[PDB]
Amino acid sequence: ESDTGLWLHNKLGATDELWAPPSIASLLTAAVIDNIRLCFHGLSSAVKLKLLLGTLHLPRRTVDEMKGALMEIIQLASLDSDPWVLMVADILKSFPDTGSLNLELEEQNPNVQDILGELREKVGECEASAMLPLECQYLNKNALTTLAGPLTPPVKHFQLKRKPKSATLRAELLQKS
Amino acid sequence: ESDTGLWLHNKLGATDELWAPPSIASLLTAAVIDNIRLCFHGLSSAVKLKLLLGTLHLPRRTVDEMKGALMEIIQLASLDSDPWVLMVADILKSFPDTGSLNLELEEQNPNVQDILGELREKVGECEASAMLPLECQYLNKNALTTLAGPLTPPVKHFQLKRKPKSATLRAELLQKS
Amino acid sequence: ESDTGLWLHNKLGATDELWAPPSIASLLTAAVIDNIRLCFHGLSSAVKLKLLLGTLHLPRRTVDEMKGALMEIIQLASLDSDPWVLMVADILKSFPDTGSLNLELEEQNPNVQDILGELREKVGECEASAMLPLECQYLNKNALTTLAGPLTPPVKHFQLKRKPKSATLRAELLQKS
Amino acid sequence: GEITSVSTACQQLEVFSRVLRTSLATILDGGEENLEKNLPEFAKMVCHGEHTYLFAQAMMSVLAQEEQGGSAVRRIAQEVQRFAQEKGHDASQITLALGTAASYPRACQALGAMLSKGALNPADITVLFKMFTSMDPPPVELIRVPAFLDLFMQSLFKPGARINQDHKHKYIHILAYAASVVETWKKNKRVSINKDELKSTSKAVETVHNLCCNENASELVAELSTLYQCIRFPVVAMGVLKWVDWTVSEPRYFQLQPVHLALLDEISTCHQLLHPQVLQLLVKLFETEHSALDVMEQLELKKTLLDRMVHLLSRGYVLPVVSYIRKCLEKDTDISLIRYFVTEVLDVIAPPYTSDFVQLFLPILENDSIADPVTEFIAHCKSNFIMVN
Amino acid sequence: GEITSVSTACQQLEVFSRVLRTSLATILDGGEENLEKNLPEFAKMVCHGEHTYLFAQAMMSVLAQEEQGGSAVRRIAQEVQRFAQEKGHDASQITLALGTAASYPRACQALGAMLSKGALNPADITVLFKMFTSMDPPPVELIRVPAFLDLFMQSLFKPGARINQDHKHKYIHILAYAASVVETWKKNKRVSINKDELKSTSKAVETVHNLCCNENASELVAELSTLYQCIRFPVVAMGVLKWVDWTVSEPRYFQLQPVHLALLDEISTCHQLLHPQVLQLLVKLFETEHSALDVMEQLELKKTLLDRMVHLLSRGYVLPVVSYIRKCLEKDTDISLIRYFVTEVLDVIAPPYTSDFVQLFLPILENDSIADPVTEFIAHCKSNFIMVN
Amino acid sequence: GEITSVSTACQQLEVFSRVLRTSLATILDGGEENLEKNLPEFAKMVCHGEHTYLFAQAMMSVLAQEEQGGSAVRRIAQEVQRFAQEKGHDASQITLALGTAASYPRACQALGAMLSKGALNPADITVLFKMFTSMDPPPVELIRVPAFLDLFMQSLFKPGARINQDHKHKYIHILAYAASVVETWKKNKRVSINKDELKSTSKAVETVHNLCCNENASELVAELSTLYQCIRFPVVAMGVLKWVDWTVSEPRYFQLQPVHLALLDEISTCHQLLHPQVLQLLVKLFETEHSALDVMEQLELKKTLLDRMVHLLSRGYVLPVVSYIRKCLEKDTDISLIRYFVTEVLDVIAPPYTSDFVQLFLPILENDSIADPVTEFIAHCKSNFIMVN
Ligand SMILES: [Cl-]
Ligand SMILES: [Cl-]
Ligand SMILES: [Cl-]
Ligand SMILES: [Cl-]
Ligand SMILES: [Cl-]
Ligand SMILES: [Cl-]
Structure with missing residues (x-):
């Protein structure tokens, strides 16, 4: 295709959109993928970030076909000048072959090293009665305990001398039947 | 006495009371003192702290009689596991022989060393016009100066142009007679 | 003159005045200047500070005549005990010969070294859009740019959709004629 | 204290990384209680673009692997995934690849x-x-x-x-x-x-x-x-809670003589993990402008919603409940309603109290202190508690 | 800012020691003026048990041995000994052995x-x-x-x-x-x-x-x-002060036409060590709810108590006196009484002023500044004083 | 926070030097905007005596030699030279020798x-x-x-x-x-x-x-x-500004039907260096007690002075202008006038906004928020801006 890089600008160059546009799977033709290695150097970061993230929205069948071409692009992105493009290229390098993202990201990456360094220590400081994930709210005790361990009982901030007014209300509504 | 340690629990085990109970001098029989070395290991800290402090409430005559037994108990307390029992045992070790408390408390005692270390420096920082003890308020100038030195005069925050309204009131009440 | 130092006290000893009194040029007779080297040691700092600053208020003709006597006094002041007298003596030492103050003041002078040290760094931190001197407000663009360089344009905090109400007011007053 | 635009914070990876580090620190500090406040400031940044969403979620997945407290980050990630969903962003492809x-x-x-x-x-x-x-x-x-x-x-x-x-x-x-x-x-x-x-x-x-x-x-x-x-069954309790929500939250409902709210007391008694949702609902209904209801009906209804809070409080969800009543007092709600909460709570609690509870319940007590269990509580606190530093 | 129960603070010797160190530091910082505030927070901890009382008093006796300022700690120890006495604790055995x-x-x-x-x-x-x-x-x-x-x-x-x-x-x-x-x-x-x-x-x-x-x-x-x-004779002045106290403080006293208060001016003039007690009495009588007195009688009586404060102030006990008037102004007392204190003080003082005095008397001047010696004082301060940092 | 007398600060060279260092730091931090506040505290010290004036001006001349930002110190020195002049001190001999x-x-x-x-x-x-x-x-x-x-x-x-x-x-x-x-x-x-x-x-x-x-x-x-x-011509604009000043500032002027103020809009449009003087004039006329003017005339006149501020704001002098309106709102001016400034400004501005502008214009918006471009601005800010730390 003639000026295939100019055409990518008219499709993904929209600064307003920062997420995958509707029908992004149809925009990424197999032939287009093979044309990206020809015009990548001149592309802006915004378009590259839409391009790279676009590979996640492709069906497993379409990805496996041009996985060689995808590896070539992701490699190109790992040699980019934009730090955002570099970071994304490091997360997707495991995708075209495994279908899963890379979570080994500390190798020669000061940002990641500084993030994980500081927060791993912070996460360990708040292990006492730490908030659980949302799925735990849907689980029976045995599934809950298997997954997250025993729940810490509520702190006793006082001692109940008598039962509240809501205790009498339960007995009433049970008597009505 | 059979189960003399159980009996001490029913007399001093009250968690509510943290000071010497009324008629503590009658509870500490000379024979009981000789029974404390037999059951001390099982006693709680609370009871031991009531026991050790109890020796101060005994008349000088009663203390001097079993001073050997008292030394034995205070020694036992200096080998206790509770830091409170240890601290009290170090203050009373001078008592059964001299009738006075020990104020040499820095030897291998990090707490005391940290307290006195920080505060000795703080006390010296506020030597300028430092507040005097209460007895000084009752003393004539010569006794006051002998004991605490010359008083620092009040800071002059302004200059009096005229005498206040209270000056005229003194002259009036002196004229009435 | 007999007790010429006592006479200087009755003329400049006023603690209320801390600036050059009116007609200070008439108080500093040429003969008086030659008498200052005789009575300087007993003078107070206040009077010396009025004396030294007084040399600035003398006409260029009067200064050049006793410049040798002035150098002698300024030297005496540079050996004074008062830090204020010393600082002033270091600023005026260049005056009787050049008519200009000394701005080389860092030599063995901890105060000046600490002032300039800290502030030179502070001045460089606020070079971005730094406030200009007052004379710049009176200058045409070409003189302004020659002297202080191009002005930094105002930060654009928003974008004008329409012109304000004051724009219509200008057109009206132009139509009245 | 300082404010920042989303665009600026995302343009530089270095800058984005630093804000992520402090935001995550704050959310982990705020606990689940202050989650509803500390979350959107982080989520808005992260959901600026798909690439920003990817990076932040990759960082959170790695942290979630920590045996000690990593679950708390998985919670944060899920809260952000929901933010993206509610703003029209599709993050399913990333979530599954994650x-x-x-x-x-x-x-x-x-x-x-x-x-x-x-x-x-x-x-x-x-x-x-x-x-x-x-x-x-x-x-x-x-x-x-x-x-x-x-x-x-x-x-x-x-x-x-x-x-x-x-x-x-x-x-x-x-x-x-x-x-x-x-x-x-x-x-x-x-x-x-x-x-x-x-x-x-x-x-x-x-x-x-x-x-x-x-x-x-x-x-x-x-x-x-x-x-x-x-x-x-917790899964059922979630369902009933959501159902009660959709039922009551829908306008033109309060024309009846309420069993729907009474079920909430049973939810609270059985499931501690649902307490912050129960309260979230109770404060949503407490801040609704019922224009169709009569003034006296609005008062009693709010008293009813408070009765649910006191019950919830008595189930061990006290600090976040006490905290909310103090917030609407210092900043709206009429004095009579605040006094009713105090009355009902002081009628069922007794020593010992924790310093954490006193630090929140004593200040709310002495703002307009005219109403005896109140002064007796103050006397207890003055005798048994100490301010430090 | 943080609150702590007495029980918790005393259970661990390590923890008790740390609170003692900061509390004592604060009291030594507050001087004799802020003594009445900073003392009970420390005393309540120390008087929790006889063993806690012993340890703290042993520490204070050792500090009291310091030639430079050790007397200030002896004062603190005596203040605590009084606290124990007033709470029904017998600490005579310890005091004498000390x-x-x-x-x-x-x-x-x-x-x-x-x-x-x-x-x-x-x-x-x-x-x-x-x-x-x-x-x-x-x-x-x-x-x-x-x-x-x-x-x-x-x-x-x-x-x-x-x-x-x-x-x-x-x-x-x-x-x-x-x-x-x-x-x-x-x-x-x-x-x-x-x-x-x-x-x-x-x-x-x-x-x-x-x-x-x-x-x-x-x-x-x-x-x-x-x-x-x-x-x-200071010992006699103490007696008269206590006697005047018991006389006036007792209810149903203000039915007479007051010489008892007039004696206080003589106490103040002779003994600087009794100034904080004189003021302590004056503020106790200034905050009493005289239900038996007529409204106009309550006003003039409070003016009378203020006349004692102005006299005390003129004896060199100014900063603690000025400080109290500012406290009841920012936080109750009617405006007329505060304006009378300002009027009387400004009628007898003159430059030079210290920055410590201006820092307290200038703020109280410019809260409701409508009453000329007032504006002239403000003009002086604006000309001669500077804020730093 | 702390206050200091001028005499004390000048007696010791060591002490004077330290205050000079922090005062100069503050003034350089405050920029030209906060210059009118941060200046007199420094100038009063420096102008205490001729010797103090000499030392400070010698220090400022040496700093003024710095190619990068030294001009900002020359400005400060000139501001102080003016202070000495207005207080009756003659500093011409020093200025020329400098x-x-x-x-x-x-x-x-x-x-x-x-x-x-x-x-x-x-x-x-x-x-x-x-x-x-x-x-x-x-x-x-x-x-x-x-x-x-x-x-x-x-x-x-x-x-x-x-x-x-x-x-x-x-x-x-x-x-x-x-x-x-x-x-x-x-x-x-x-x-x-x-x-x-x-x-x-x-x-x-x-x-x-x-x-x-x-x-x-x-x-x-x-x-x-x-x-x-x-x-x-800037030199002419300065003249017109001063002339308009002397004309309008003089009492008994507002009996006419105002072209003098209209000229200010032209001054602002042509010369950015004169913006802080234009505003200084506008706030001087905005705080004048016009006792001869009718109440309705006072209202419309203040609206007229606000019209000058909105014009000035639209010329790129926005932050100091927005800052002043917030100051008189939080601390006097009637609500109607503040609402007019908001209305007029929101009628001509549009995204993108800087965080610096939002940090000042959003708070002034949500104090008494009842007046739609207002809520739409709030919606934009909530969507596009984030608080940090
Ligand atoms: Cl559960
Ligand atoms: Cl408790
Ligand atoms: Cl005396
Ligand atoms: Cl002064
Ligand atoms: Cl220009
Ligand atoms: Cl924006």
Whole structure:
């Protein structure tokens, strides 16, 4: 295709959109993928970030076909000048072959090293009665305990001398039947 | 006495009371003192702290009689596991022989060393016009100066142009007679 | 003159005045200047500070005549005990010969070294859009740019959709004629 | 104190990384209580672009691997995933690639479809159902995605709803499977699958589902004993809570003589994990402008909502409840309502108190202190507590 | 900012030690002025148990040995000893074992008895009296215990009181001995005893004692010149201050046409060490709810109490006085009373002012600044003072 | 927070030096916006005595030599020199000895005389004039002293004034010379002198000078087009600003039906360096107690002064303008006037906004938020901005 890089600008160059546009799977033709290695150097970061993230929205069948071409692009992105493009290229390098993202990201990456360094220590400081994930709210005790361990009982901030007014209300509504 | 340690629990085990109970001098029989070395290991800290402090409430005559037994108990307390029992045992070790408390408390005692270390420096920082003890308020100038030195005069925050309204009131009440 | 130092006290000893009194040029007779080297040691700092600053208020003709006597006094002041007298003596030492103050003041002078040290760094931190001197407000663009360089344009905090109400007011007053 | 535009914070990776580090630190400090405040400031940045969303979620997945407290980050990640969903962003492709969901082709396909559309369809539900009925079913952790389970809530307990009777058992089974089934693993190998609680849980859900969709509810009070027994199943309690929400939150509801709110007391008593949602609902109904209600009716209704808070408080969710009453006092609500909360709470509590409770309940006591258990509480605090530093 | 229970702070010696260190630091920082605030937070902890009281008092005795400022800690220890007394705790056994009081058997015995009972009895008073009359009397520092001297105040100057005439001279002598006698020591050996002022001081106390117990006082004004001369003795001034206190503080007193308050001006003029007690009394009477008094009578009475403060202020106790007027202004008292204090103070003061005074008197001036010496003071301050940092 | 007397701060050189260091730091931090606040606290200290003034000015001259930002210190020094002048202190001798002005005997003599007297006299004006007409004129930087140029303002544009017609061209020429002439230097040697703009600038000043002294102005509107063209010369704009100031600021002026204020909009549009003076004037007229004006007339007049601020704001002087409106809102001005400023500003601005603007304009928006562009602005801010730390 003639000026295939100019055409990518008219499709993904929209600064307003920062997420995958509707029908992004149809925009990424197999032939287009093979044309990206020809015009990548001149592309802006915004378009590259839409391009790279676009590979996640492709069906497993379409990805496996041009996985060689995808590896070539992701490699190109790992040699980019934009730090955002570099970071994304490091997360997707495991995708075209495994279908899963890379979570080994500390190798020669000061940002990641500084993030994980500081927060791993912070996460360990708040292990006492730490908030659980949302799925735990849907689980029976045995599934809950298997997954997250025993729940810490509520702190006793006082001692109940008598039962509240809501205790009498339960007995009433049970008597009505 | 059979189960003399159980009996001490029913007399001093009250968690509510943290000071010497009324008629503590009658509870500490000379024979009981000789029974404390037999059951001390099982006693709680609370009871031991009531026991050790109890020796101060005994008349000088009663203390001097079993001073050997008292030394034995205070020694036992200096080998206790509770830091409170240890601290009290170090203050009373001078008592059964001299009738006075020990104020040499820095030897291998990090707490005391940290307290006195920080505060000795703080006390010296506020030597300028430092507040005097209460007895000084009752003393004539010569006794006051002998004991605490010359008083620092009040800071002059302004200059009096005229005498206040209270000056005229003194002259009036002196004229009435 | 007999007790010429006592006479200087009755003329400049006023603690209320801390600036050059009116007609200070008439108080500093040429003969008086030659008498200052005789009575300087007993003078107070206040009077010396009025004396030294007084040399600035003398006409260029009067200064050049006793410049040798002035150098002698300024030297005496540079050996004074008062830090204020010393600082002033270091600023005026260049005056009787050049008519200009000394701005080389860092030599063995901890105060000046600490002032300039800290502030030179502070001045460089606020070079971005730094406030200009007052004379710049009176200058045409070409003189302004020659002297202080191009002005930094105002930060654009928003974008004008329409012109304000004051724009219509200008057109009206132009139509009245 | 300082404010920042989203665009600026995302343009430089270095800058974005630093804000992520402090924001995450704050959220972990705020606990689940201050989660609702500390979250949007972080989520807005992260959801600026798909690439920003990717990076932040990759960082959070790595932190979630920490045995000690990593679960708290998984919670944060899920809260952000919900933010993206509610703002029209599709983050299903990233979510599935983020975990080991992609290891199972058929299931991951059907699960991503529904997560992308944001609803449950019989086509993708059947695909999941057949697989979990076979001799070798996929890992249960796969269907335990918050975004997925919520789709069941609005499909089974929402006033309505559009559903196929020939597929209803499939919807119920998959939900009950996610809620009760327990797997055992050794060296990433699944040894056994425990389904003992699948039958009773599936029945509990089916029972309450039939009650909720029916409505008119005036028949609710008659089957209350059955309803309370089912609420003991957490998955069912979530459903009832959501159902009570949609029922009461909808305008033109307060024209009746309320059993819907009474069920909340049973929810609170049985499930501590649902306390912040119960309170979140109670404060949503407490801040609604009921223009159709009479002034006296508005007062008593708010007193009723406070009665739920006092009950919740008595179940051990006290500090976040006490904290809210102090917030609307210092900043609106009439004095009579605040005094009622104080009265009712002081009528059921007794020493010993913690310093954390006193530090919140004593200040609210001495703002307009005219109302004796009040002064007696103050006397206790003055005798037994000390300010430091 | 943070609050802590007493029990928790005392359970661990490590924790108790740390709070002691910061509390003592704060009290030493607050000076005698902020003593009344910073003390109870420390005292409540220390007086939790006898063992906690022992440890803290042992620490304070060691600090009191410092030549430079150690006296300030002895003051703190005595303030805490009083706290224990007022809370029903007996700390006489510890107090005597704490010093060199135990070195003298007979005297220490009698002194501990009365300190434990909290009153003076003729039996133990005679034992002390005979010893201080002999050729070899015990150290005067022994009877110079604040807790002891106070027992004399409520026995000699309190409205009443129960006392034996055959023992009265013994009570007077011991008090006058503690107040006037001066010993000289060399290498812990007492060289001489100076009793020159014992005769006149004993007479001063006896004179005012007879006046105070008499009352009706309407005879007070007649013997005012004698009364003023005696007030010059600090021990007597303390007595008059306490007597004026018990007289005025007792309800149903303000039905007369006040000489009792006028004596306070003489106290202030003679004794700077009594200024914080004079003010403490004046603010106690300024905050009393006189329900029996007429509104206009309440206003003028408060103006009268302010006249005492302005006099006290003019004696060099200005900063704590100015500080109190600012506290009740920012936080109650009607505007007219605050304006009267400003008017009277500005009518007698003049430059130079210290920055410490301006920092307190200028803010109180410009809150509701409508009342010229006021604007002239502001003009002076604006010209001569500078804010830093 | 802490206050200090001027005397104390100046007695010790060590102490004075430290305050100088922090004061100068603060003023450099406050920028030109907060200059009017941070200056007097420093100036009062520096102007305590001639020796203190000398030391501080010597320190500031050395700092002014820094190529990067040294000009900002020269500004501070000139602000202090003005403070000394306004307090009756003569600092002309120091000012001239401070620079290279003393290098030119005749001129420096005449320049110091007028700077000491504080006015312009024909004698010393002629001496300067003849020298700048000769083939070898002195450096133009010599007549570019703020204190000097101001003397021209009150002599040429002040309502009046006392001036000689035979000398008027000399006054005009010297001013126009200081404003337009451009010299080139190489190794402290003056290569050329550019006078191209001297003719047109001199004419601009002469034209407006004749208009201002005339008055009655009712003839102002007729020659408005000529007047606007001249205002483009900064030296003339300064004159008009000062003239408008003296005209309007003088009491008993608001009895007319205002062209004087309308000229300010043209000043603002042409000269960014005059924005802080334009605002300084506008806030001076906004805080004047017009006792002769009717209530409705006072309201509309203040609305008129606000119209000038909105225009000024639209010229890129927004942050200091927005800041002032927030100050009088949080601390006086009636609500209607504040709402008008908000309305007018929101009617002409649009995204993108900076965080610095939002941080000031959003708080002023949500104090009494009842008035849609307002809520739409809040919606934008909530969507696009984030709080950090
Ligand atoms: Cl549970
Ligand atoms: Cl407690
Ligand atoms: Cl005294
Ligand atoms: Cl002063
Ligand atoms: Cl310009
Ligand atoms: Cl924006």
